[PDB]
Amino acid sequence: ATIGRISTGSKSLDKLLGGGIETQAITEVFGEFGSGKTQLAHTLAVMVQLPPEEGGLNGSVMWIDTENTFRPERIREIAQNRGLDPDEVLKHIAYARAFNSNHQMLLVQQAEDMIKELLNTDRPVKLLIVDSLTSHFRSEYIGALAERQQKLAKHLADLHRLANLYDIAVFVTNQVQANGGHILAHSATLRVYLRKGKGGKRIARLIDGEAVFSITEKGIED
Numbered sequence: 001a002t003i004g005r006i007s008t009g010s011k012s013l014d015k016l017l018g019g020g021i022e023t024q025a026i027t028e029v030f031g032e033f034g035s036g037k038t039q040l041a042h043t044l045a046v047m048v049q050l051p052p053e054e055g056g057l058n059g060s061v062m063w064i065d066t067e068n069t070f071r072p073e074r075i076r077e078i079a080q081n082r083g084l085d086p087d088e089v090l091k092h093i094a095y096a097r098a099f100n101s102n103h104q105m106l107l108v109q110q111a112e113d114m115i116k117e118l119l120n121t122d123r124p125v126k127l128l129i130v131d132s133l134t135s136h137f138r139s140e141y142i143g144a145l146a147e148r149q150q151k152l153a154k155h156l157a158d159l160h161r162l163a164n165l166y167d168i169a170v171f172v173t174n175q176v177q178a179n180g181g182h183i184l185a186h187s188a189t190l191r192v193y194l195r196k197g198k199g200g201k202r203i204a205r206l207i208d209g210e211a212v213f214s215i216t217e218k219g220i221e222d
């Protein structure tokens with residue numbers, strides 16, 4: 001398949017990304033608590049449902065939530081301010097809460113079944129969100145870094161396989177602050193550092209110019 005792109009909702013961020021986040025790729029956004037990673041996830045879950053003329057892929061979404069941070073009412077607001085019907089947008093987001101890191105790993109295998117079911121339809125899965133990818137692994141493997149890296153490595157390999165095999169954009173978030181960070185090392189296809197700036201602006205930079213955007217009723221925008 002050709003590489004599809006999903007607009008982030010911000011022209012600035014899209015330019016930094018070459019048009020948007022790519023299918024057949026893992027995009028990892030990392031930054032401190034409150035930097036806007038989950039807002040970007042919510043916005044992408046709407047944008048992907050637009051037609052290509054508007055920066056989407058007419059796609060369905062799957063969302064693995066590890067911190068109970070998915071907000072359907074926020075999806076509704078973004079959809080209504082992106083000219084979509086909020087009920088239809090929510091009906092095309094498959095949502096699951098991961099209880100722990102092992103359940104999170106099983107959910108990726110479960111996601112493949114729904115991906116296969118939708119593959120030949122007019123609304124194939126085009127976006128798989130894992131928010132937060134690292135939170136359970138970090139808490140469960142304190143003092144056991146080598147084992148944590150083994151399990152993360154297989155999890156990321158599973159997500160890669162889905163991205164490439166089924167032409168899906170995988171979008172993952174990773175909280176990194178004071179003294180923390182191996183990030184995801186070199187595993188993601190693309191690493192985006194996100195931070196707060198003056199006056200509530202958010203600033204994004206590719207790791208390995210800078211885009212500036214705001215969080216609004218449209219999700220994010222310039």
Ligand SMILES: Oc1cc2ccccc2cc1O
Binds near residue numbers: 062063094096107108
């Ligand atoms: O109904 C489902 C929703 C999911 C969401 C995320 C990952 C896997 C899922 C599997 C389902 O059957």
